[PDB]
Structure 1
Amino acid sequence: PVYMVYVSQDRLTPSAKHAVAKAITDAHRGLTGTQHFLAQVNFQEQPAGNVFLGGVQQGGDTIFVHGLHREGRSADLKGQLAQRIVDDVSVAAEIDRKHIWVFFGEMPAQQMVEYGRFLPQPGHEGEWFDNLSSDERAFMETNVD
């Protein structure tokens, strides 16, 4: 999964990004079982006053999370991935919930690539990791937190 996190500039300190991007990652891993290193959190920063809202220019206190998952998960599961991400990013960012937008897109894994490899079905994963090369699995083990 790729999570695009849109935020106004200098709202999250370099430690506020780490805490939020960890909250997201633990949320995913716990709920779906996809390994930590498979999650990516990509903060898109823009100078504040670029988020309009019913024509109303906003400050720099709005966060939009765009997830990109592969298909195969129930709506039940996705509603729970979404609310936990509302609840935990509120904490790690220290921001009220009313400012959080969370959208999820889904795609067939067969047109989804991470670490230069095609992904497996959400009902796979453990097997897929082992049968990758040694150096590929080593580089993956580096990105855990």
Structure 2
Amino acid sequence: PVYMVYVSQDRLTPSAKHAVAKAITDAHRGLTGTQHFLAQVNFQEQPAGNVFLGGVQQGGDTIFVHGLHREGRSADLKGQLAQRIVDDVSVAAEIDRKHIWVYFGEMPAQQMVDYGRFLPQPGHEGEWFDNLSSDERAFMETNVDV
């Protein structure tokens, strides 16, 4: 996946960013079976005060997670995954769940490219990976936080 994570500048320490990235990655792998290394978490920082809720300028606590997924999973699974992101990002970032917004968008795998390659359909990641070139597999394997 690509998870775009919109946070205020300096709200998350580097270690908190790492914990939030791990929380999202583990949740995605845990519920979908996709390999760790396909989960991209891309932090987008902006100065505090760039978020407005109902026209009211916010402090730095809002977190918006925009997850970009392949089509093909059930509404039930996507609900479980969104809830798990809310719960686990809240713990990892020490931010109340009321600050956390999570939207999932989906596209056909045929118009999605990770690491320069088109993605397979959900659940087919194992044989897709095994058929990648040796150097591609090796590069991908470096991106696993156990």
Q: Which category describes the TM-score, using the shorter chain as reference length? A: over 0.9
Offset of residue 30 of structure 1: 0.4
> Hey, what's the Cα distance between the residues in 1 that align with 2:124 and 2:63?
32
* Correspondence for 1:69: 69
> Deviations 1:86-123 (Å, cap 9, x if unpaired)?
00000000000000000000000000000000000003
> Deviations 1:22-77 (Å, cap 9, x if unpaired)?
00000000000000000000000000000000000000000000000000000000
SS in structure 1 at match of 2:48 = coil
Q: Given the two structures, how large is their TM-score scaled by the length of structure 2?
A: 0.99
SS in structure 2 at match of 1:122 = coil
> Hey, what's the Cα distance between the residues in 1 that align with 2:116 and 2:123?
20
Offset of residue 126 of structure 1: 0.5
Calculate the aligned-residue CA RMSD, in Å.
Answer: 0.4
Which consecutive residues of structure 1, in runs of 5 or more, have no partner in the other structure? none
Which consecutive residues of structure 2, in runs of 5 or more, have no partner in the other structure? none
SS in structure 1 at match of 2:22 = helix
> Hey, what's the Cα distance between the residues in 2 that align with 1:95 and 1:60?
10
4+ aligned runs moved over 3 Å, structure 1: none
* Correspondence for 1:87: 87
> Hey, what's the Cα distance between the residues in 1 that align with 2:79 and 2:109?
20
